[PDB]
Amino acid sequence: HPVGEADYFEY
Amino acid sequence: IQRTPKIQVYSRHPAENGKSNFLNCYVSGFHPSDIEVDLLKNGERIEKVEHSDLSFSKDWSFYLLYYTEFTPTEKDEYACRVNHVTLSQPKIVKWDRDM
Protein backbone atom coordinates (compact mmCIF):
# COMPACT_ATOMS: atom_id res chain seq x y z
CA HIS A 1 0.00 0.00 0.00
CA PRO A 2 1.46 3.40 -0.99
CA VAL A 3 2.18 6.30 1.37
CA GLY A 4 -0.56 8.94 1.57
CA GLU A 5 0.59 12.53 1.13
CA ALA A 6 -0.66 15.53 3.14
CA ASP A 7 -2.72 18.07 1.17
CA TYR A 8 -0.70 20.27 -1.21
CA PHE A 9 2.52 18.23 -0.81
CA GLU A 10 5.07 19.66 -3.27
CA TYR A 11 8.80 19.67 -4.00
CA ILE B 1 22.40 13.90 -19.33
CA GLN B 2 21.02 11.02 -21.44
CA ARG B 3 21.67 7.25 -21.42
CA THR B 4 21.40 4.92 -24.43
CA PRO B 5 19.35 1.69 -24.11
CA LYS B 6 20.94 -1.73 -23.71
CA ILE B 7 19.06 -4.21 -25.92
CA GLN B 8 18.60 -7.99 -25.58
CA VAL B 9 16.51 -10.11 -27.94
CA TYR B 10 15.67 -13.65 -26.78
CA SER B 11 12.96 -16.27 -26.29
CA ARG B 12 11.15 -17.14 -23.03
CA HIS B 13 11.71 -20.88 -23.53
CA PRO B 14 14.53 -22.76 -25.33
CA ALA B 15 13.83 -22.26 -29.05
CA GLU B 16 12.41 -25.29 -30.86
CA ASN B 17 11.29 -25.13 -34.50
CA GLY B 18 7.52 -25.50 -34.84
CA LYS B 19 6.90 -25.04 -31.11
CA SER B 20 5.07 -21.92 -29.89
CA ASN B 21 7.12 -19.63 -27.66
CA PHE B 22 7.48 -15.96 -26.68
CA LEU B 23 9.82 -13.46 -28.35
CA ASN B 24 11.25 -10.91 -25.92
CA CYS B 25 12.98 -7.60 -26.40
CA TYR B 26 14.37 -6.24 -23.15
CA VAL B 27 15.45 -2.59 -23.18
CA SER B 28 17.22 -1.25 -20.09
CA GLY B 29 19.71 1.34 -18.80
CA PHE B 30 18.14 4.23 -20.72
CA HIS B 31 17.16 7.82 -19.91
CA PRO B 32 14.83 9.65 -20.68
CA SER B 33 11.90 7.21 -20.66
CA ASP B 34 10.52 7.84 -24.18
CA ILE B 35 11.42 4.84 -26.34
CA GLU B 36 10.10 3.14 -29.48
CA VAL B 37 10.39 -0.65 -29.69
CA ASP B 38 9.19 -2.93 -32.48
CA LEU B 39 9.53 -6.67 -32.96
CA LEU B 40 10.11 -7.67 -36.58
CA LYS B 41 9.41 -10.88 -38.47
CA ASN B 42 11.53 -11.04 -41.65
CA GLY B 43 11.95 -7.24 -41.56
CA GLU B 44 8.25 -6.48 -41.01
CA ARG B 45 6.70 -5.10 -37.80
CA ILE B 46 4.65 -7.56 -35.72
CA GLU B 47 1.26 -6.10 -34.74
CA LYS B 48 0.05 -7.37 -31.34
CA VAL B 49 3.21 -6.67 -29.30
CA GLU B 50 2.75 -5.99 -25.57
CA HIS B 51 5.05 -4.37 -22.99
CA SER B 52 5.61 -4.17 -19.24
CA ASP B 53 4.77 -1.11 -17.12
CA LEU B 54 7.49 1.54 -16.92
CA SER B 55 9.84 1.05 -14.00
CA PHE B 56 13.46 1.91 -13.19
CA SER B 57 16.66 0.61 -11.56
CA LYS B 58 18.68 1.91 -8.59
CA ASP B 59 20.74 4.13 -10.93
CA TRP B 60 17.43 5.73 -12.12
CA SER B 61 17.65 4.23 -15.61
CA PHE B 62 14.44 2.80 -17.08
CA TYR B 63 13.69 -0.74 -18.24
CA LEU B 64 10.87 -2.30 -20.27
CA LEU B 65 10.06 -5.76 -21.62
CA TYR B 66 8.38 -5.96 -25.03
CA TYR B 67 6.96 -9.37 -25.96
CA THR B 68 4.80 -11.35 -28.36
CA GLU B 69 4.02 -15.02 -28.89
CA PHE B 70 5.85 -16.57 -31.86
CA THR B 71 6.64 -19.93 -33.43
CA PRO B 72 10.32 -20.17 -34.45
CA THR B 73 11.22 -21.91 -37.72
CA GLU B 74 14.48 -22.72 -39.51
CA LYS B 75 14.48 -19.77 -41.93
CA ASP B 76 12.30 -17.06 -40.30
CA GLU B 77 14.45 -14.20 -39.00
CA TYR B 78 13.41 -12.14 -35.98
CA ALA B 79 14.74 -8.82 -34.69
CA CYS B 80 14.04 -5.84 -32.39
CA ARG B 81 13.97 -2.26 -33.71
CA VAL B 82 14.73 0.41 -31.10
CA ASN B 83 14.53 4.19 -31.36
CA HIS B 84 15.56 6.53 -28.54
CA VAL B 85 16.64 10.20 -28.33
CA THR B 86 20.27 9.02 -27.88
CA LEU B 87 20.13 7.26 -31.26
CA SER B 88 20.48 9.11 -34.58
CA GLN B 89 19.04 6.10 -36.43
CA PRO B 90 16.85 3.17 -35.25
CA LYS B 91 18.91 0.23 -33.97
CA ILE B 92 18.23 -3.31 -35.23
CA VAL B 93 19.25 -6.24 -33.04
CA LYS B 94 18.67 -9.65 -34.62
CA TRP B 95 17.51 -12.63 -32.57
CA ASP B 96 20.29 -15.19 -32.13
CA ARG B 97 18.96 -18.31 -30.40
CA ASP B 98 22.36 -18.96 -28.75
CA MET B 99 22.18 -15.52 -27.08
Binding site: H1, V3 | P32, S33, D53, Y67
Partner: protein
Protein backbone atom coordinates in the same frame (compact mmCIF):
# COMPACT_ATOMS: atom_id res chain seq x y z
CA UNK C 1 15.32 -14.78 3.13
CA UNK C 2 15.10 -10.99 3.12
CA UNK C 3 12.14 -9.21 1.53
CA UNK C 4 11.38 -5.69 0.40
CA UNK C 5 8.53 -3.55 -0.89
CA UNK C 6 9.06 -0.64 -3.27
CA UNK C 7 6.98 1.97 -5.06
CA UNK C 8 8.43 3.67 -8.12
CA UNK C 9 7.00 7.02 -9.30
CA UNK C 10 7.83 8.58 -12.66
CA UNK C 11 6.56 12.07 -13.56
CA UNK C 12 7.33 13.31 -17.07
CA UNK C 13 6.63 16.78 -18.51
CA UNK C 14 5.98 17.11 -22.25
CA UNK C 15 5.56 20.76 -23.32
CA UNK C 16 3.13 21.12 -26.22
CA UNK C 17 1.81 17.58 -25.69
CA UNK C 18 -0.51 17.86 -22.69
CA UNK C 19 0.03 17.80 -18.95
CA UNK C 20 2.87 15.79 -17.36
CA UNK C 21 2.31 12.03 -17.18
CA UNK C 22 2.44 10.28 -13.79
CA UNK C 23 3.12 6.54 -13.53
CA UNK C 24 3.35 4.52 -10.31
CA UNK C 25 4.24 0.84 -9.95
CA UNK C 26 4.58 -1.26 -6.78
CA UNK C 27 6.85 -4.27 -6.25
CA UNK C 28 7.41 -6.93 -3.62
CA UNK C 29 10.93 -8.24 -4.26
CA UNK C 30 11.10 -8.88 -8.04
CA UNK C 31 7.32 -9.15 -8.48
CA UNK C 32 5.25 -6.17 -9.61
CA UNK C 33 1.78 -6.12 -8.03
CA UNK C 34 0.12 -2.76 -8.90
CA UNK C 35 0.20 -0.04 -11.56
CA UNK C 36 -1.24 3.42 -12.16
CA UNK C 37 -1.00 5.53 -15.33
CA UNK C 38 -2.50 9.04 -15.59
CA UNK C 39 -2.59 8.57 -19.39
CA UNK C 40 -4.97 5.58 -19.19
CA UNK C 41 -8.47 5.93 -20.68
CA UNK C 42 -9.81 5.68 -17.12
CA UNK C 43 -6.90 6.23 -14.68
CA UNK C 44 -7.10 3.81 -11.74
CA UNK C 45 -4.92 1.47 -9.70
CA UNK C 46 -4.88 -1.92 -11.43
CA UNK C 47 -3.73 -5.34 -10.09
CA UNK C 48 -0.61 -6.90 -11.65
CA UNK C 49 -0.26 -10.03 -9.48
CA UNK C 50 -3.03 -12.56 -8.67
CA UNK C 51 -2.52 -12.41 -4.87
CA UNK C 52 -3.43 -8.69 -4.68
CA UNK C 53 -6.82 -9.19 -6.38
CA UNK C 54 -8.43 -10.23 -3.06
CA UNK C 55 -8.08 -6.68 -1.64
CA UNK C 56 -11.50 -5.02 -1.27
CA UNK C 57 -13.01 -1.83 -2.80
CA UNK C 58 -11.61 0.49 -0.08
CA UNK C 59 -8.03 -0.57 -0.94
CA UNK C 60 -8.34 0.12 -4.67
CA UNK C 61 -10.14 3.43 -4.16
CA UNK C 62 -7.64 4.58 -1.51
CA UNK C 63 -4.79 3.71 -3.90
CA UNK C 64 -6.39 5.58 -6.80
CA UNK C 65 -7.15 8.64 -4.60
CA UNK C 66 -3.45 8.75 -3.62
CA UNK C 67 -2.09 8.34 -7.17
CA UNK C 68 -4.60 10.86 -8.61
CA UNK C 69 -3.49 13.37 -5.96
CA UNK C 70 0.18 12.60 -6.73
CA UNK C 71 -0.48 13.24 -10.44
CA UNK C 72 -1.54 16.83 -9.58
CA UNK C 73 1.19 17.20 -6.96
CA UNK C 74 4.04 16.12 -9.27
CA UNK C 75 2.82 18.46 -12.02
CA UNK C 76 3.28 21.31 -9.51
CA UNK C 77 6.65 19.91 -8.45
CA UNK C 78 7.90 19.73 -12.07
CA UNK C 79 7.07 23.44 -12.38
CA UNK C 80 8.88 24.13 -9.09
CA UNK C 81 12.08 22.31 -10.15
CA UNK C 82 12.12 23.98 -13.58
CA UNK C 83 12.15 27.24 -11.59
CA UNK C 84 14.95 26.07 -9.22
CA UNK C 85 17.24 25.37 -12.19
CA UNK C 86 16.29 28.43 -14.28
CA UNK C 87 15.16 26.15 -17.11
CA UNK C 88 12.89 27.17 -20.00
CA UNK C 89 9.30 25.98 -20.33
CA UNK C 90 10.33 24.38 -23.65
CA UNK C 91 12.13 21.27 -22.35
CA UNK C 92 10.88 17.90 -21.12
CA UNK C 93 11.94 16.85 -17.63
CA UNK C 94 11.48 13.91 -15.28
CA UNK C 95 11.07 13.47 -11.53
CA UNK C 96 11.46 9.93 -10.25
CA UNK C 97 10.81 8.71 -6.73
CA UNK C 98 11.61 5.37 -5.11
CA UNK C 99 10.50 4.45 -1.55
CA UNK C 100 9.88 1.45 0.66
CA UNK C 101 11.05 -0.94 3.31
CA UNK C 102 13.53 -3.80 3.66
CA UNK C 103 12.86 -6.72 6.00
CA UNK C 104 15.47 -9.08 7.41
CA UNK C 105 15.02 -12.89 7.24
CA UNK C 106 13.24 -12.65 10.63
CA UNK C 107 10.64 -10.11 9.42
CA UNK C 108 11.55 -6.84 11.15
CA UNK C 109 12.45 -3.50 9.54
CA UNK C 110 16.04 -3.60 8.31
CA UNK C 111 15.88 -0.10 6.80
CA UNK C 112 13.62 2.37 5.00
CA UNK C 113 14.10 4.38 1.81
CA UNK C 114 12.62 7.54 0.29
CA UNK C 115 14.67 8.85 -2.60
CA UNK C 116 14.05 11.25 -5.47
CA UNK C 117 15.84 12.18 -8.68
CA UNK C 118 15.60 14.92 -11.31
CA UNK C 119 16.48 14.12 -14.93
CA UNK C 120 18.08 10.82 -13.82
CA UNK C 121 20.35 12.55 -11.31
CA UNK C 122 20.01 12.13 -7.53
CA UNK C 123 18.09 15.08 -6.08
CA UNK C 124 17.04 14.40 -2.47
CA UNK C 125 17.07 11.37 -0.17
CA UNK C 126 15.71 10.53 3.27
CA UNK C 127 18.71 9.47 5.37
CA UNK C 128 18.86 6.01 6.98
CA UNK C 129 17.93 7.59 10.36
CA UNK C 130 14.54 8.43 8.77
CA UNK C 131 14.69 11.90 10.35
CA UNK C 132 16.92 13.98 8.06
CA UNK C 133 17.55 14.70 4.38
CA UNK C 134 20.51 14.78 2.01
CA UNK C 135 20.05 17.43 -0.70
CA UNK C 136 22.15 17.09 -3.87
CA UNK C 137 22.50 20.84 -4.52
CA UNK C 138 21.20 24.33 -3.68
CA UNK C 139 17.98 23.56 -5.60
CA UNK C 140 17.23 20.44 -3.55
CA UNK C 141 18.07 22.51 -0.44
CA UNK C 142 14.83 24.41 -1.14
CA UNK C 143 12.77 21.21 -1.30
CA UNK C 144 14.45 20.18 1.97
CA UNK C 145 13.35 23.42 3.72
CA UNK C 146 9.78 22.83 2.49
CA UNK C 147 9.80 19.22 3.72
CA UNK C 148 11.29 20.13 7.09
CA UNK C 149 8.58 22.79 7.50
CA UNK C 150 5.85 20.25 6.70
CA UNK C 151 7.56 17.61 8.91
CA UNK C 152 7.62 15.15 5.99
CA UNK C 153 10.42 12.96 7.41
CA UNK C 154 8.34 12.29 10.56
CA UNK C 155 5.46 11.15 8.33
CA UNK C 156 7.76 8.97 6.18
CA UNK C 157 9.27 7.37 9.30
CA UNK C 158 5.78 6.54 10.64
CA UNK C 159 4.81 4.90 7.33
CA UNK C 160 8.11 3.09 6.75
CA UNK C 161 8.30 1.65 10.29
CA UNK C 162 4.54 0.97 10.46
CA UNK C 163 2.23 0.57 7.45
CA UNK C 164 4.96 -0.32 4.92
CA UNK C 165 6.12 -3.29 7.02
CA UNK C 166 2.55 -4.29 7.98
CA UNK C 167 1.38 -4.37 4.34
CA UNK C 168 4.55 -6.12 3.13
CA UNK C 169 4.02 -8.89 5.70
CA UNK C 170 0.37 -9.14 4.57
CA UNK C 171 1.44 -9.50 0.90
CA UNK C 172 4.14 -12.06 1.76
CA UNK C 173 1.48 -14.24 3.44
CA UNK C 174 -1.22 -13.78 0.76
CA UNK C 175 1.28 -14.52 -2.02
CA UNK C 176 3.46 -16.98 -0.07
CA UNK C 177 3.25 -19.71 -2.73
CA UNK C 178 5.09 -17.40 -5.15
CA UNK C 179 6.72 -14.59 -3.11
CA UNK C 180 8.26 -17.06 -0.64
CA UNK C 181 9.15 -19.70 -3.25
CA UNK C 182 12.67 -19.61 -4.67
CA UNK C 183 13.01 -21.23 -8.10
CA UNK C 184 16.53 -22.55 -8.74
CA UNK C 185 18.17 -21.87 -12.13
CA UNK C 186 18.26 -24.58 -14.77
CA UNK C 187 21.94 -24.52 -15.74
CA UNK C 188 24.12 -25.71 -18.65
CA UNK C 189 27.30 -24.89 -20.59
CA UNK C 190 27.36 -24.31 -24.36
CA UNK C 191 30.42 -24.32 -26.63
CA UNK C 192 30.93 -22.26 -29.80
CA UNK C 193 34.24 -22.34 -31.75
CA UNK C 194 35.48 -18.92 -33.03
CA UNK C 195 38.71 -20.02 -34.76
CA UNK C 196 41.08 -22.98 -35.12
CA UNK C 197 42.47 -22.49 -31.59
CA UNK C 198 39.92 -20.41 -29.61
CA UNK C 199 36.36 -21.33 -28.54
CA UNK C 200 33.62 -19.75 -26.39
CA UNK C 201 32.20 -21.38 -23.26
CA UNK C 202 28.83 -19.88 -22.24
CA UNK C 203 27.26 -20.63 -18.86
CA UNK C 204 23.45 -20.44 -18.78
CA UNK C 205 21.06 -19.86 -15.88
CA UNK C 206 17.35 -20.08 -16.78
CA UNK C 207 13.97 -19.97 -15.02
CA UNK C 208 15.15 -18.59 -11.68
CA UNK C 209 13.40 -16.46 -9.06
CA UNK C 210 14.31 -14.11 -7.47
CA UNK C 211 16.62 -12.20 -9.85
CA UNK C 212 19.64 -12.17 -7.50
CA UNK C 213 22.28 -14.59 -8.83
CA UNK C 214 26.04 -15.00 -9.18
CA UNK C 215 27.66 -16.51 -12.29
CA UNK C 216 31.45 -16.73 -12.35
CA UNK C 217 33.95 -18.48 -14.59
CA UNK C 218 37.13 -19.82 -13.04
CA UNK C 219 40.30 -20.94 -14.79
CA UNK C 220 42.35 -23.35 -12.63
CA UNK C 221 40.22 -22.26 -9.66
CA UNK C 222 41.05 -18.59 -10.24
CA UNK C 223 38.30 -16.02 -11.00
CA UNK C 224 38.16 -14.67 -14.56
CA UNK C 225 36.41 -11.35 -13.78
CA UNK C 226 38.15 -9.19 -16.41
CA UNK C 227 37.72 -11.87 -19.12
CA UNK C 228 34.08 -12.85 -18.55
CA UNK C 229 31.31 -11.38 -20.71
CA UNK C 230 28.35 -11.05 -18.38
CA UNK C 231 24.88 -10.04 -19.64
CA UNK C 232 22.32 -8.18 -17.56
CA UNK C 233 19.81 -10.41 -15.77
CA UNK C 234 16.70 -10.40 -17.97
CA UNK C 235 13.02 -11.26 -17.37
CA UNK C 236 11.65 -14.34 -19.14
CA UNK C 237 8.13 -12.86 -18.92
CA UNK C 238 6.70 -15.62 -16.71
CA UNK C 239 7.99 -14.13 -13.39
CA UNK C 240 11.39 -15.86 -13.80
CA UNK C 241 14.77 -14.55 -14.94
CA UNK C 242 17.63 -15.48 -17.28
CA UNK C 243 21.39 -14.78 -17.32
CA UNK C 244 24.59 -15.97 -18.97
CA UNK C 245 28.36 -15.61 -18.53
CA UNK C 246 30.85 -16.33 -21.31
CA UNK C 247 34.61 -16.77 -21.52
CA UNK C 248 36.81 -17.30 -24.61
CA UNK C 249 39.19 -20.22 -24.09
CA UNK C 250 42.05 -21.81 -26.05
CA UNK C 251 40.88 -24.98 -27.84
CA UNK C 252 41.89 -28.11 -25.91
CA UNK C 253 41.94 -26.24 -22.58
CA UNK C 254 38.16 -26.44 -21.93
CA UNK C 255 38.53 -28.81 -18.94
CA UNK C 256 40.66 -26.19 -17.16
CA UNK C 257 37.52 -24.00 -16.86
CA UNK C 258 34.59 -24.13 -14.34
CA UNK C 259 31.33 -22.17 -14.06
CA UNK C 260 30.01 -21.46 -10.56
CA UNK C 261 26.37 -20.64 -9.82
CA UNK C 262 25.04 -19.13 -6.58
CA UNK C 263 21.31 -18.70 -6.07
CA UNK C 264 18.93 -18.69 -3.10
CA UNK C 265 16.89 -21.58 -4.59
CA UNK C 266 19.85 -23.97 -4.85
CA UNK C 267 20.34 -26.76 -2.26
CA UNK C 268 24.07 -26.13 -2.85
CA UNK C 269 26.16 -23.79 -5.07
CA UNK C 270 26.68 -25.42 -8.48
CA UNK C 271 29.95 -26.13 -10.27
CA UNK C 272 29.60 -26.74 -14.02
CA UNK C 273 31.94 -27.52 -16.90
CA UNK C 274 31.47 -28.20 -20.61
CA UNK C 275 30.23 -31.75 -21.26
CA UNK C 276 31.14 -32.50 -24.92
Amino acid sequence: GSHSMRYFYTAMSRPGRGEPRFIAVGYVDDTQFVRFDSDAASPRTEPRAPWIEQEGPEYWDRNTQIFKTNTQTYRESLRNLRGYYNQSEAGSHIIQRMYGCDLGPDGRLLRGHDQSAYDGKDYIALNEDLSSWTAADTAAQITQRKWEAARVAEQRRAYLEGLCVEWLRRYLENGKETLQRADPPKTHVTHHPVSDHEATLRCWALGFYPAEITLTWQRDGEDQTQDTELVETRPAGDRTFQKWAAVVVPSGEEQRYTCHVQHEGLPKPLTLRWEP
